Amino acid sequence: SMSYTWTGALITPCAAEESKLPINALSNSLLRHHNMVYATTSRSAGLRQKKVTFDRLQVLDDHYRDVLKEMKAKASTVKAKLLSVEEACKLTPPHSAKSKFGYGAKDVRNLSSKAVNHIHSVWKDLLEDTVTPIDTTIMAKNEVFCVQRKPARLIVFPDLGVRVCEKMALYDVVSTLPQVVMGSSYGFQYSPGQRVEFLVNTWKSKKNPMGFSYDTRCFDSTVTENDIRVEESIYQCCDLAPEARQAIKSLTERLYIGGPLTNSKGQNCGYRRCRASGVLTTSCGNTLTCYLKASAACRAAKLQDCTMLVNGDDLVVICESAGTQEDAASLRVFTEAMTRYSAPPGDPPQPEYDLELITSCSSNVSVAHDASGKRVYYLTRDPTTPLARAAWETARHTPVNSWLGNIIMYAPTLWARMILMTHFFSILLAQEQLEKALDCQIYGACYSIEPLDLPQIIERLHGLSAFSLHSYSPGEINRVASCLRKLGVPPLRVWRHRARSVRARLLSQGGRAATCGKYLFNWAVKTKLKLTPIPAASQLDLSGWFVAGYSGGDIYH
Ligand SMILES: CC(C)CCn1nc(-c2cccs2)c(O)c(C2=Nc3ccc(NS(C)(=O)=O)cc3S(=O)(=O)N2)c1=O
Numbered sequence: 001s002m003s004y005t006w007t008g009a010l011i012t013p014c015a016a017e018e019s020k021l022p023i024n025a026l027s028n029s030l031l032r033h034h035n036m037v038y039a040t041t042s043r044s045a046g047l048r049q050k051k052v053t054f055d056r057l058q059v060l061d062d063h064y065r066d067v068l069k070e071m072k073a074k075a076s077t078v079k080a081k082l083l084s085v086e087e088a089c090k091l092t093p094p095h096s097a098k099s100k101f102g103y104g105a106k107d108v109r110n111l112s113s114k115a116v117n118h119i120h121s122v123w124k125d126l127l128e129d130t131v132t133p134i135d136t137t138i139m140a141k142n143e144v145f146c147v148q149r150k151p152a153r154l155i156v157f158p159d160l161g162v163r164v165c166e167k168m169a170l171y172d173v174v175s176t177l178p179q180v181v182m183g184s185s186y187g188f189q190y191s192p193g194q195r196v197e198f199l200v201n202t203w204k205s206k207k208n209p210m211g212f213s214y215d216t217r218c219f220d221s222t223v224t225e226n227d228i229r230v231e232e233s234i235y236q237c238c239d240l241a242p243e244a245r246q247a248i249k250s251l252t253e254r255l256y257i258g259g260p261l262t263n264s265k266g267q268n269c270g271y272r273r274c275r276a277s278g279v280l281t282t283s284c285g286n287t288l289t290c291y292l293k294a295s296a297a298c299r300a301a302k303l304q305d306c307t308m309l310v311n312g313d314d315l316v317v318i319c320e321s322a323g324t325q326e327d328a329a330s331l332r333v334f335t336e337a338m339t340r341y342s343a344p345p346g347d348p349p350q351p352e353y354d355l356e357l358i359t360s361c362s363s364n365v366s367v368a369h370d371a372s373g374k375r376v377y378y379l380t381r382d383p384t385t386p387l388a389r390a391a392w393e394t395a396r397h398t399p400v401n402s403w404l405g406n407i408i409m410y411a412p413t414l415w416a417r418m419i420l421m422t423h424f425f426s427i428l429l430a431q432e433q434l435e436k437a438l439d440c441q442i443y444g445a446c447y448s449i450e451p452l453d454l455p456q457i458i459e460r461l462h463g464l465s466a467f468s469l470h471s472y473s474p475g476e477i478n479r480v481a482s483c484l485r486k487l488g489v490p491p492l493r494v495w496r497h498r499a500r501s502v503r504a505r506l507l508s509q510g511g512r513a514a515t516c517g518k519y520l521f522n523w524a525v526k527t528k529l530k531l532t533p534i535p536a537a538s539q540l541d542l543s544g545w546f547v548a549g550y551s552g553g554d555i556y557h
Contacts, residue, residue, distance in 0.1 A: 003221040004053045006270040011049070011140050011154070012263040017041035022395040030423055031391045032488030039392065040152035042140035047151035052221040058342040060226075063296035068230065071292060074181045075237035080172040082241045085119050086111060088167035093446045093556040095399045095439070097137075099160035108164060122161040123168065126250040127243060133259040134158050136276060138269055146388040146487065155552065157278030158255055163554045166280040169247035173235055174284035175548045181234070182291050187311030187361065188283070188443050188549035191461050192379040192409055199365055200377050202307045202318045203355045210321035211358045212331060214294065214338065215346040219313035222342050223275035223289060228257045230292070231285045256281060283444055283549035286312040290343070297337035301330050309360065312549055316360035327351040356475065368412070369471040376465055380476060383415040383483050390420060394427070404449055405440035411458040412466040415480050418495040421520050425502050434513055444551035452512040455519040456537040467519045467531050499524035
C-alpha cells in the first residue's frame with residue numbers, strides 16, 4: 001500500500017517561521033557566514049511529502065520468521081507495569097503541544113482535574129473501542145542545518161490526552177523490552193563512552209574486521225501495517241495487566257497502523273499507512289523492526305560473525321571480512337534482502353576497514369591521549385550541524401538547547417571543549433544565568449539541566465580524562481578546521497584566548513562556577529591544575545539517562 005494518500009490540503013504552520021539565521025550582537029563572535037545557516041519550515045513540506053510517498057511491497061521468508069520467533073521468546077520474559085495517570089502526567093514535557101480539548105502540557109504536569117478527567121475518558125474509550133481511527137496532527141519540523149537545502153521533516157502526533165494514555169500503557173514496555181529482546185545490540189542502553197567501548201571491543205573481536213552503516217531511505221515510510229502488527233505481537237508477549245493488553249491492541253489498530261492526518265488549521269490532509277514519527281512507540285517500534293529485518297538480512301547474506309548495533313532506524317554492522325570483492329557482494333545481498341523486507345537503502349552501504357571511518361548515529365570513534373599519554377578512544381562527529389544550531393541559539397531562545405546536549409554528549413571532543421563550552425559559558429557569565437536550569441534532549445527525551453552541574457555530569461559519563469584529552473587525530477583536527485573555514489568560525493587559537501578569560505571569570509566567582517572554570521577549561525592554560533574527583537558527582541541521579549530511546553515520544557525526565 002501507499003505510505004500516504006494526500007487530499008491536497010497543505011501542511012500548515014502554527015505561527016510565523018524563520019528560515020534565515022537570526023542575528024544579534026553575539027553572532028559574529030561565533031560565525032561570520034550567516035547565509036550558510038538555515039531552518040526548515042512548513043513551506044518546504046511539499047518537497048518532503050513527495051519523497052516519503054511510495055508503495056511498499058514486502059516479501060517475508062524463513063530467516064525473517066526465525067528471527068521473529070527468537071525475539072518473541074525473549075519478549076515473553078518481560079513483565080511490564082501500567083503507569084497511573086499521575087505517573088504518565090509527570091513524564092510530559094512542559095512545552096508539549098496542548099490538547100484540542102481545553103488544556104495544555106502545564107495543566108497535565110501540575111495534574112489539573114480538567115486534564116486528568118479528559119485523560120480518563122480517553123483511556124476508557126481505548127478499552128471500549130478497538131476500531132475507530134484516532135486523529136493525528138501533521139506538522140513540519142523546524143530544524144537548523146548548514147547548506148550543503150534539506151526540506152522539513154514531518155511530525156505526526158495524536159492529541160495530548162492520547163499521548164498520556166500511551167505512556168500509561170506502554171512506557172514501561174518501550175523502556176525495558178528492547179534491551180531484553182536485542183541485548184548488547186540495543187544502542188540506547190549506552191552512554192557515548194559505553195558505545196565507544198562496545199564498538200571498539202566488537203571491532204577487536206574480529207580477525208579481519210569489516211563494518212558498514214546501512215541507511216534506509218525514509219525509514220518511517222518503509223514501515224508497513226505488517227511491521228506494526230508484528231511489533232504489537234512482540235509487545236503482547238510481555239506479562240501485562242489486562243487493561244494494558246487492551247489499550248495496546250486498541251492503540252495499534254486505531255493509531256500505530258495508520259490514520260487520518262489533519263493540519264494545524266483543522267483540514268484533512270490525507271491518510272497515513274506507515275510509522276507515525278510522533279508516537280511513544282516510534283523509537284522502540286523502529287529499533288525492533290530495523291533489528292528484525294537486519295538480523296534476517298545478515299543470515300540471508302551469510303555475513304560471518306556479524307554484530308549489530310541498532311538505534312531506531314540507525315544501523316551499523318561489524319563482521320568478519322572475506323576480502324573486498326566478497327564483502328561488496330555480501331552487502332549487495334544484504335541490501336537485496338532488506339529491500340525485500342521493505343527497507344531499501346538511501347545511499348548503498350559500503351564496507352569499511354577503518355573503524356574511525358564508520359559513521360553511525362551521525363558519530364564516529366576517534367582517538368586522543370590523556371594526561372599520562374595513554375591512548376583513549378572517544379566519540380565525535382562532524383561539528384557542522386552542532387555549530388549551525390549553536391549559532392541559532394546564540395540569537396534565539398529555543399525550547400531545546402542543543403549546545404548543552406552537545407556539550408554533555410561530546411564533552412571529550414576538541415570542538416565541544418574549545419568552542420561550545422567557551423562560547424556559551426561566556427554568554428551565561430554575562431547574563432549571570434549560570435544557575436538557571438535549561439532544557440536539552442538526550443536520545444529523544446527532554447531533560448532539565450543546570451549548566452553548573454556540567455563538570456559532575458561529564459566526570460560521571462566520560463571520566464576525568466575528558467578534561468585532559470590532547471593530541472587529537474590528524475583526521476579529526478582537519479575536519480574541525482575545515483568546518484570552521486566553511487562557517488567562518490574564528491580559529492581555535494582565538495577560542496583558547498577567549499577561554500583563558502572565561503576560565504578566570506569563572507574561578508573569580510568561586511563555588512560551582514570556579515569548579516566549571518577549573519575542570520572545563522584546564523585545557524586553556526599553559527600550566528594546568530591537578531584534576532581530582534568532584535565530591536558532588538555521586539549525588540546526581542543519572543538513572544534513566546541511557547536506558548532507552550524516545551524520539552518523537554513526548555518524554556520528560
Ligand atoms: C553521542 C551519541 C552516543 C551518538 C549520537 N547521538 N547523539 C545524540 C545527542 C547529541 C547531543 C544531544 S543528544 C542523540 O540523542 C542521539 C540519538 N540517536 C537516535 C538515532 C536514531 C533515531 N531514529 S528513530 C526516530 O528513533 O527511529 C533516533 C535517535 S534519538 O532521537 O533518540 N537521539 C545519538 O545517536
